[PDB]
RNA sequence: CGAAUACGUCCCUGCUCCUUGCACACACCGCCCGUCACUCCACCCGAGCGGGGUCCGGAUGAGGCCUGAUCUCCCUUCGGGGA
């Protein structure tokens, strides 16, 4: 099972965030669909390394922070 | 024998430093305020009572000193004079 998800490779790692710190804003890069290179930042749970691939239920959220 | 998870944060709980304000420095378990109650102190407002000054009146007013009459006494230069 895998619903409409969209892939979206990791470029760069920003700040830490989340209350307790276990957030990682980070900056994406959508691989398919019909973005096809629109760059998104988000606010990802758990360990990432660049190159990684997190897979969004959407698109169109994009939370910013410093 | 033998892992899970994170490789972070200050949210909670604590510590360290810096900065700021403070009526605190046995240092916030700090300092401190007023009412009420208890003891004492002197100080007002004073009912009341009783004196003593002082200004106005009213009345009486001792006494002395001026004078008029009258009386008595003594001196008389017979003029009066004195008490």
Redesign the pocket.
């Given at each position: 099972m895998s619903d409409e998800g969209y892939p979206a490779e990791v470029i760069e790692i920003v700040?830490?965030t989340?209350?307790?710190?276990?957030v990682?804003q980070v900056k994406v890069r959508i691989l398919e669909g019909r973005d096809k290179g629109r760059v998104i930042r988000r606010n990802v749970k758990?360990?990432?390394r660049v190159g990684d691939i997190v897979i969004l239920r959407e698109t169109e959220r994009e939370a910013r922070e410093i």
């Open positions: 700040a830490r989340g209350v307790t710190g276990g990682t758990g360990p990432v």
